[PDB]
Design a protein around this ligand. Structure first.
Ligand code: ATP
Ligand code: ADP
Ligand code: ADP
Ligand code: ADP
Ligand code: MG
Ligand code: MG
Ligand code: MG
Ligand code: MG
Lengths: 366, 371, 369, 370
């Protein structure tokens, strides 16, 4: 049984092949103590991984091994992979052909190091690395293209025509969920609330998921928010305090369409989708326009499809049909597509085997 | 062999062996010397008296406490107390037993340096260690989380511990304890016409405070009832046959803990100090600190202090939070009980400060090893 | 003329435009008695503001209406402003327009309440609110650079390029002189000295200013302090008692570079400045490195410029040249820059007039500023 | 106008507000005959109060109605007040409000009974109770300093800073002139002279007031007394006998600085003054050291000011400057301040009027009077 391990910047998605939902969806954080231990009872583990770090985040400094789709701390990454295999999956790595998903345009050394560590430290019989965006289209049962994948670290829109991922027409935007969390932390100081440490970042992140939404008309929404109190909501802090946010609800997600809110000179998600499509062939443009796929966890805000539909229609020939696909399972679409691909019997011929890694160069995966 | 535990304090001194349930010897920490002229020669008149010996003959002596506000003041009387504690109360040889000592937080570094020097050069102990009173209090409670309120006789301190990781930046040490409450009761006892100004009569007033004083839930309402009728009045008999009756002084002396301005102190009460300490910690641990409120000390034995603390903290804390105050019936020796548990543990048996390390690094090794 | 009032968290620096030094420099404290008065033949005021509180601090409870740059007690702030205009400056607020300062990344309701009080309680003809960090760069006489403004309240970094304050690279750290004073109070107990009251806090503040300094190397300095007693210095308390500190001198200011000493996860001032520079565009980073303007009172420790120079140099690329600008008069730079700004004729078009507030409410300040 | 009464343990000082010295100062004693009256035809008034008792003290017994600053006999006290108001002053209490004094730490029943007596027995229109130490500072023309107010029954120190009193730093001691008189009575038996009767107690008091001084260096002045007889001073008894006292001259006043002479566990006046100063705020100790107001009859020994200055200097740091204030009129400082306070225009709004006593009874004295 293959293991489809889709590891991202924010969340780690792992589970057996042939299922429909990852078994272990836990944060990708490694925390270490920052205080002085007084009690001698219990060893007081020097490093917590996953939900253990989240529960004890008060006395820990949370760290992210992956920075924007790029692995930074290899030692922390090895700990997380060890935690997923033993503590979460409870299955040995040497008895399963694991499948991994890496971000598009990954450095060759990054992929070789991942393959080398997996084959040696975990002794996996075989492994294959697939593109995150392609699997999202696979889970949707399409081969059209323009798959907008926005997560915690990066935001990509990879076009895949007839199973062929067009490499030149791949646009990348650095703005993602983590930057939206930082933006909300900065503009939450207007009402007096102050969040600074890494533990507060998780608290603010939960606020953004529960309350923040997307407004199709920013100017009209701003006027109504400043003229009425209907938009204001409440959220109880872990220590019992009650906070109230008004126009901050529909302002934080607005950074996706207007990256200038966080000092970014790039284009929005709607403009970077339009630019990517026209870079493809003329015949493909009609195919991409009718079948546009929204994936990732960042695109889970209410009304995101309606705003995106209105935006793309503005930069449209006004005669083609613009349709956006937003499946309800878009948060786990990358893993669901990977699970389907692994379950395919025809796909079982494609696996980078161990002796091909050793008897040949480590670049055999490429 | 067995590791000794000595919980020397400003008031009562607790000593014994690790692994037991209660201290073997509990005697006051006073040293008395004669102040009159001897007339009867050959009466086996001892020079100085310590412990209960001084208390029994306090009428002709001047009782002097060698420890004030947690800090050891006289290093000659203290050596007398330890010598009496080891050779008379415990009847053991210090040369063969390691000793686990105990010190209050936020104390001078020379305090534990002189403790280390005294125990290694005079009593010649094999090993020793210094522990924090509030940490040992949580050891006896059987939990590794919460905030401890340790009010004794010289110092009241709060130490918040979460999952075994203490927070040194949220430790609040207050210098109001039972000694100040006893002195305050003396001033308000003169209000009714009773005068007790001596070292011996200080003990008499202290016994009055323990037997009669209590804490009122509503101070202003309790004032009204005391003035309205005489239902709030109890009598006490002096050691010479006199009878004294007190009224509202019963619940006025313990009120200085919650209203320190009575004795001219600008600091806040114990309820405010605990609340400030909790909110100086992380936001993700405040809920676990609110549920676990540990009280361990002689001062906290008033009939109603748990209810008063619960009411005061409840108003300060938000309505959603649930406040629970832990008041074990045997909290007067919680520090020693926890110290007995800690010394018996096998892990602590490797963290002692052996004699060889001291002899090659001086008395400064106590800072790099102890907490 | 116009009025400039730099309302800090520890000191109040008011005066007139066109001057080189502030006129009134007094602590921002409102003290009230805590004992019971018995002398009938004596004037007993209810509250004392300014230097009067310091003189009679023995029997008073000193209170700061401003904490962490945010005004908490508005009635006390109203008293302080009334004292500043009448008892200290002896002028009429209804005659001179006022220029007030607010720290960056402050609550929106702070300036709304501030402009309401000024236009109603004091009835100023016009007013304006300016960022302290921008005024710090004006005093130094430059347009491009990064400012490290550390005082008694908050410590913030604002990279200003050609007069533009970039809003996406504004850092803010709540560690400053007040937190250093508390740290020195806590670590002074290791030698037997105990200072607990608010009056004792003022005494400790004087000790830190006169004795504490910054060591280029922390570890070798600690070895020197433990090796011999060549670093110990004395200080006479107001009661005539003598205290001595040998290693608390360079340990208290080190909290700025190592905020973990007071249990703070945030990085030091040298790391915060580096992070602010990298958050800017790559085409202006060289200009920001050259112009490192240090302003405020907390940056007055000896050797802090040399220590900051070597800390940023290690973090910065080797090719780049690092220059830490630390003018000797960097304690009143915020007021000096604001004094210059109000004196300029171009700035006179940005005043918020009385009629403008009467037709748009307190919210006019956000649009104008 | 209003009256000012300074009824103490030993002396009664009464007069009118606004004056400089009390109009009538007489001992606070009541005497009753103990012998038998062979000639019953004479007047032979049952009880004698004041200087009348002192003159006829040969056949009388002297009883003090006030002991240690606390009124003990409440019937002789009323007789003293009646004599003070109707004979010494010859005024009408029903028309003149009175201002009384009390020790700092006294039972609350003392003032309540005084308030009840004044408003019922004497029908005064208004009344007030003031602390003796505060009134001492009024007569000194100051508003900051610690007052060492000694007397016949109680010695107390009250620190005041800028008109604000610190009640927690108040120190009270029950060693005063009466105890010193008894100690001199005991040590006078060393040379053979015996004084046992209350009448002889007054004679001993006169001897103490005349020949008694505070030695600067107790050990050295003792050495001089043994070496030579230059310290020998004589005194003549009322009968006609003469006595000689030597080292007893400077040993009786030494009990103030060494209370162990009479078997007392309290500290000396210099130690008590230092302890009270150190209990105050650190910032105000500099002003307290400079201002040390010494008031009271007991503080009139020759050399007590010099001795106190030397003793406090040793305890205080070298940087500190110690000044002992001792005006020559310190024997009436309490009354002088009382006259000044009553004459003040602001004080006229805080008298306890009859109507307030009518509705609240003899309990409003705590709320109004400090
Ligand atoms: N309902 C929601 N609304 C808004 N944001 C959400 C929601 N659920 C999750 N998020 C945010 O989306 C991110 C997680 O999405 P996702 O599972 O795609 O991340 P990932 O796999 O770590 O990303 P990537 O592969 O791009 O690095 C987090 O930043 C999380 O806070
Ligand atoms: N039942 C009681 N009620 C009130 N106070 C008490 C009671 N029992 C003891 N105390 C006070 O506790 C103080 C010291 O208690 P303890 O904690 O044993 O001393 P230490 O703090 O030195 O260990 C004493 O001064 C005494 O006044
Ligand atoms: N010579 C000095 N050395 C160290 N710190 C100083 C010195 N002078 C002033 N400070 C600190 O500067 C702080 C206030 O500076 P300032 O910026 O003028 O006040 P504010 O922050 O209110 O504007 C004080 O808290 C003080 O500790
Ligand atoms: N010259 C003196 N030398 C020594 N003692 C004196 C002298 N004059 C007065 N005294 C003492 O002062 C005491 C009373 O003083 P005073 O304070 O006026 O009375 P009261 O204590 O009633 O107010 C007397 O007991 C007397 O012994
Ligand atoms: Mg992903
Ligand atoms: Mg204890
Ligand atoms: Mg400032
Ligand atoms: Mg008197």
């Amino acid at each position: 049984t293959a293991l489809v391990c889709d590891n991202g910047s924010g969340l780690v998605k792992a589970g057996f092949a042939g299922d429909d939902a990852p078994r272990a969806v836990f944060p990708s954080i490694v925390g270490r103590p920052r205080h002085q231990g007084v009690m001698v009872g219990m060893g007081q583990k020097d490093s917590y991984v996953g939900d253990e770090a989240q529960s004890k985040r008060g006395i820990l400094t949370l760290k992210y091994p992956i920075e924007h789709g790029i692995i930074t701390n290899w030692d922390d990454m090895e700990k997380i992979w060890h935690h997923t295999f033993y503590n979460e999956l409870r299955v040995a790595p040497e008895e399963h052909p694991t499948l991994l998903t890496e971000a598009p345009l990954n450095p060759k050394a990054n992929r070789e190091k991942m393959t080398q560590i997996m084959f040696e430290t975990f002794n996996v019989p075989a492994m294959y690395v697939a593109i995150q965006a392609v699997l999202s289209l696979y889970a949707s049962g399409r081969t059209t293209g323009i798959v907008l994948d926005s997560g915690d670290g990066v935001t990509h829109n990879v076009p895949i025509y007839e199973g062929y991922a067009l490499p030149h027409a791949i646009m990348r935007l650095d703005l993602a969920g983590r930057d939206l969390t930082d933006y909300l932390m900065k503009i939450l100081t207007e009402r007096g609330y102050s969040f600074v440490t890494t533990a507060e970042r998780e608290i603010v992140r939960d606020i953004k998921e529960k309350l923040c939404y997307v407004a199709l008309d920013f100017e009209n929404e701003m006027a109504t928010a400043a003229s009425s109190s209907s938009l204001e909501k409440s959220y109880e802090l872990p220590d019992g305090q009650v906070i109230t946010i008004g126009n901050e609800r529909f302002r934080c997600p607005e950074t996706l369409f207007q990256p200038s809110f966080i000092g970014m000179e790039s284009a929005g998600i709607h403009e970077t989708t339009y630019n990517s499509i026209m870079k493809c062939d003329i015949d493909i443009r009609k195919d991409l326009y009718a079948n546009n796929v929204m994936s990732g966890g960042t695109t889970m805000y209410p009304g995101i499809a309606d705003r995106m539909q209105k935006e793309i229609t503005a930069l449209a020939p006004s005669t083609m049909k613009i349709k956006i696909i937003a499946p309800p399972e878009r948060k786990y679409s990358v893993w669901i597509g990977g699970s389907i691909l692994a379950s395919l019997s025809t796909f079982q011929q494609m696996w980078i085997t161990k002796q091909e890694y050793d008897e040949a160069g480590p670049s055999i995966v490429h």
